[PDB]
Short mmCIF file of C-alpha atoms in Angstrom, two decimals:
data_model
loop_
_atom_site.label_atom_id
_atom_site.label_comp_id
_atom_site.label_asym_id
_atom_site.label_seq_id
_atom_site.Cartn_x
_atom_site.Cartn_y
_atom_site.Cartn_z
CA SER A 227 1.67 -33.67 7.48
CA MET A 228 1.99 -36.93 8.72
CA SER A 229 5.27 -38.81 7.88
CA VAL A 230 6.10 -35.93 5.37
CA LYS A 231 8.61 -33.95 6.11
CA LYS A 232 10.71 -31.10 4.50
CA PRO A 233 14.64 -32.02 5.19
CA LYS A 234 15.96 -31.32 8.41
CA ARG A 235 17.41 -27.87 8.99
CA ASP A 236 20.39 -28.53 11.40
CA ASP A 237 19.50 -26.22 13.92
CA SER A 238 22.07 -27.29 16.94
CA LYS A 239 23.95 -24.24 16.77
CA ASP A 240 22.02 -21.70 16.80
CA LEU A 241 21.68 -21.35 20.43
CA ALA A 242 25.53 -20.31 20.55
CA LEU A 243 24.99 -18.33 17.20
CA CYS A 244 21.90 -16.46 18.83
CA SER A 245 24.64 -15.86 21.96
CA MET A 246 27.35 -14.50 19.80
CA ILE A 247 25.22 -11.99 18.02
CA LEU A 248 23.68 -10.56 21.34
CA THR A 249 27.39 -10.30 22.51
CA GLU A 250 27.74 -7.98 19.59
CA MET A 251 24.73 -6.09 20.34
CA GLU A 252 25.57 -5.84 24.22
CA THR A 253 29.25 -4.25 23.22
CA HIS A 254 27.98 -1.74 20.83
CA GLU A 255 28.54 1.82 21.57
CA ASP A 256 24.97 2.96 20.72
CA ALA A 257 23.62 -0.36 23.06
CA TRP A 258 23.27 2.03 26.66
CA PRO A 259 20.02 2.71 25.92
CA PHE A 260 18.73 -1.16 25.86
CA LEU A 261 21.23 -2.99 28.15
CA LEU A 262 18.74 -2.88 30.96
CA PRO A 263 15.03 -2.74 32.27
CA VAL A 264 13.32 0.73 31.50
CA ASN A 265 12.95 2.00 35.17
CA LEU A 266 9.03 2.07 35.72
CA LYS A 267 9.19 3.81 38.86
CA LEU A 268 11.27 6.73 37.12
CA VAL A 269 10.11 7.23 33.50
CA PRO A 270 6.60 8.73 33.66
CA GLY A 271 4.10 6.99 30.81
CA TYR A 272 6.34 3.79 29.99
CA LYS A 273 4.51 1.49 32.17
CA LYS A 274 1.08 2.63 30.26
CA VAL A 275 1.92 3.00 26.68
CA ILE A 276 4.34 -0.20 26.61
CA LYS A 277 2.50 -3.40 26.78
CA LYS A 278 5.83 -5.49 26.42
CA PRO A 279 8.84 -4.42 28.15
CA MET A 280 12.14 -5.72 26.34
CA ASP A 281 15.87 -5.17 27.10
CA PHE A 282 19.30 -7.21 26.22
CA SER A 283 19.75 -8.24 29.98
CA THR A 284 16.10 -9.90 29.74
CA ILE A 285 16.80 -11.64 26.43
CA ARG A 286 20.31 -12.58 27.70
CA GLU A 287 18.56 -14.12 30.82
CA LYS A 288 16.09 -15.71 28.98
CA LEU A 289 18.64 -17.48 26.44
CA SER A 290 20.76 -18.56 29.13
CA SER A 291 17.77 -20.51 30.96
CA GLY A 292 16.07 -22.10 27.65
CA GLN A 293 13.17 -19.57 27.40
CA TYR A 294 13.71 -19.62 23.98
CA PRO A 295 11.94 -22.36 22.08
CA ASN A 296 13.66 -21.64 18.49
CA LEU A 297 15.96 -18.92 17.09
CA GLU A 298 12.46 -16.85 15.71
CA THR A 299 11.12 -16.49 19.02
CA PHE A 300 14.73 -14.86 19.97
CA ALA A 301 14.44 -12.50 16.81
CA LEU A 302 11.13 -11.42 17.89
CA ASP A 303 12.27 -9.90 21.56
CA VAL A 304 15.22 -8.17 19.87
CA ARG A 305 12.87 -6.72 17.47
CA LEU A 306 10.46 -5.93 20.20
CA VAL A 307 13.21 -3.89 21.76
CA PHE A 308 13.59 -1.45 18.98
CA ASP A 309 9.97 -1.23 18.28
CA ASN A 310 9.56 -0.38 21.51
CA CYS A 311 12.07 2.23 21.40
CA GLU A 312 10.31 3.79 18.22
CA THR A 313 6.90 3.82 19.99
CA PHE A 314 8.29 6.16 23.08
CA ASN A 315 11.48 7.75 21.75
CA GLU A 316 11.42 10.72 18.76
CA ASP A 317 13.43 9.74 15.71
CA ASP A 318 15.55 12.92 16.43
CA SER A 319 16.50 12.54 19.58
CA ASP A 320 19.83 10.18 20.72
CA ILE A 321 17.89 7.51 21.83
CA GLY A 322 15.74 7.46 18.67
CA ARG A 323 18.51 7.47 16.34
CA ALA A 324 20.44 4.50 18.73
CA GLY A 325 17.65 2.22 18.23
CA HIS A 326 17.84 2.90 14.47
CA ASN A 327 21.38 1.99 14.32
CA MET A 328 20.82 -0.93 16.70
CA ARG A 329 18.17 -2.60 14.31
CA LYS A 330 20.10 -2.12 11.25
CA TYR A 331 23.29 -3.94 13.02
CA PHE A 332 20.88 -6.45 14.46
CA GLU A 333 19.29 -7.32 11.16
CA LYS A 334 22.54 -7.59 9.04
CA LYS A 335 24.12 -10.41 11.17
CA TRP A 336 21.11 -11.88 11.55
CA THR A 337 20.65 -12.31 7.57
CA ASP A 338 24.36 -13.09 7.27
CA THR A 339 24.53 -15.52 10.03
CA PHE A 340 21.23 -17.62 9.30
CA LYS A 341 19.81 -16.49 5.58
#
C-alpha cells in the first residue's frame, strides 16, 4: 500500500535473460513450426480460429523494441505460441508434438532462470 513496499527484487538482468532463453528456443531443432508468423493467406482456418497469433520472430521484435513491460508479459506471449499450436494441431502430428516439446523446454529454462 501507500509508502509500504515489499523489498525490491533486482530485475535489471531480466531483458538479457529473456533474450538468452529466446535464443535457445530459436535454435532448438523443433522450433521450425514457430519461427515465423503462420501465413494467414495460405492456411485455411487460421485467421478466424486463432484470435491472437504469436511466433518467435514477433516475440523477438517486441523484446528488442521495448514492448514487454515486464518478464511476465514475455512469458505470456511465449505460452500463447504453444496454446495456439494446441488449439490448431492434433497432439499426434509432428507440429503437435513439437509444441509439447517446446513448452516443456521453455518452462524448465524459466524456472531454472527465475524461480
